[PDB]
Design an enzyme around this catalytic site. Structure first.
Site: not given
Ligand SMILES: CN(C)[C@H]1CC[C@H](Oc2ncnc3ccc([N+](=O)[O-])cc23)CC1
Length: 286
Positions: A33, A35-36, A38, A51, A144, A147, A162
Site C-alpha cells: 500500500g 513504499f511499504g 501492509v 505498514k 497522491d 482510489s 498515505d
C-alpha cells in the site's frame, strides 16, 4: 496529538513475523500500500494494520511526514495512526485496521466482494471530500489522491491515507504521485492544493464508471480522456455508468459527473476549491 512508541519485536510478533503469504492461505500480508507492505495483526484484542516501509533517507523523511501530519490532523475521514516503530532501517506505521480495504479494490470487486451500490458510492465520495477539505483547511496538500489511498472501514466510511508526500504555488525537483491521477501542473513540478482537486475528479470518474484511472488493455488507456469523448458529444456519461449497480439514477450520476468535470479543468485556477466540491456533493443527495 502524541502516539504510542511500539517495539519492532512486538510488531513482528503480532503479524506472525511479517509473513509474506496471503490471508486466505494462512499468512498476514494484505498486499502492498505505498513504499511499504501492509500486514494484518492483533494488539491487545484490537485489530491493526502495520505498514512496514520498503533512498533510505527519503523513505525515513516520508515516515516522519506521515507522523507529523497525523499528529496535527485527526478527522472522521482520515485513517487513524495508533503508533510507530523506528528502530533502525525497518520503519513501521501502526493504524486502526480498515476491514473493507481500498476503494480501488472495492470498485474492481477484488477477491469476489460484491459491487458497491450507488448509495454507498455517494457516501464514499462525500466522506473523501470531507477528508480533503480537512487537510486543505489545515494548509496541507496530499499530493497522491487516488482510489487506492481511500480506505473503507467497517461501515464503508471513506478514510484518506498515505500522508508521506504531503506538504504544508511552489515548485519541486522531485515529481511524485501517480501519473494517471496527476494534474498537468503537478506533472511539471508545481505544488498546489488545486492538484488534489484534479486527482479527486479522476476518483469521481472511477466511482461513476467502475473503471481504473489507467488500464493498459483499454481504449482510452487513461480514464481522464473520457471527459473529452463526452464533451465532443460522441458519447454521454450514461454510456459509461458502471453496469455493476442497480440503484444509480441518471440525475445524481450527472450531478456527480458535473463535479468531476469541473475538478478536471486543465487550467488550475478554473477548478473549484474543495469547499465548493463538498457543497456540490451534498446537494446531489439532498
Ligand atoms: C491492494 N489491496 C489489497 C490493499 C488494500 C488496503 C491495504 O491497506 C490497509 N488495509 C487495512 N487497513 C489499513 C490501514 C491503514 C493503511 N495505511 O496505509 O494508512 C493501510 C491499510 C493494503 C492492500
Amino acid at each position: 496529538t502524541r502516539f504510542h512508541s511500539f517495539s519492532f519485536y512486538e510488531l513482528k510478533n503480532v503479524t506472525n513475523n511479517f509473513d509474506e503469504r496471503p490471508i486466505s492461505v494462512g499468512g498476514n500480508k494484505m498486499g502492498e500500500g505505498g513504499f511499504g507492505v501492509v500486514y494484518k495483526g492483533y494488539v491487545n484484542n484490537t485489530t491493526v494494520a502495520v505498514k512496514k516501509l520498503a533512498t533510505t533517507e527519503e523513505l525515513k523523511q516520508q515516515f516522519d511526514q506521515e507522523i507529523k501530519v497525523m499528529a496535527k490532523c485527526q478527522h472522521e475521514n482520515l485513517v487513524e495512526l495508533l503508533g510507530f516503530s523506528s528502530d533502525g532501517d525497518d520503519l513501521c506505521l501502526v493504524y486502526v485496521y480498515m476491514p473493507n480495504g481500498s476503494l480501488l479494490d472495492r470498485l474492481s470487486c477484488l477477491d469476489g466482494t460484491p459491487p458497491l451500490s450507488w448509495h454507498m458510492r455517494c457516501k464514499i465520495a462525500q466522506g473523501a471530500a470531507n477528508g480533503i477539505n480537512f487537510l486543505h483547511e489545515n494548509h496541507h496538500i496530499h499530493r497522491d489522491i487516488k482510489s487506492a489511498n481511500i480506505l473503507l472501514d467497517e461501515a464503508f466510511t471513506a478514510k484518506i491515507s498515505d500522508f508521506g508526500l504531503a506538504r504544508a504555488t511552489v515548485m519541486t525537483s522531485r515529481i511524485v504521485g501517480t501519473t494517471a491521477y496527476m494534474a498537468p501542473e503537478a506533472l511539471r513540478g508545481e505544488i498546489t492544493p488545486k492538484s488534489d482537486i484534479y486527482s479527486f475528479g479522476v476518483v469521481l470518474l472511477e466511482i461513476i464508471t467502475g473503471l481504473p484511472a489507467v488500464d493498459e488493455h483499454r481504449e482510452p488507456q487513461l480514464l481522464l480522456d473520457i471527459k473529452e469523448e463526452i464533451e465532443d458529444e460522441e458519447k454521454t456519461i450514461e454510456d459509461y455508468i458502471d453496469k455493476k449497480m442497480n440503484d444509480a439514477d441518471s440525475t445524481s450520476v450527472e450531478a456527480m459527473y458535473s463535479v468531476a468535470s469541473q475538478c478536471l479543468h486543465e487550467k488550475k485556477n478554473k477548478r473549484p476549491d474543495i469547499k465548493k466540491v463538498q457543497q456540490l456533493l451534498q446537494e446531489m443527495t439532498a
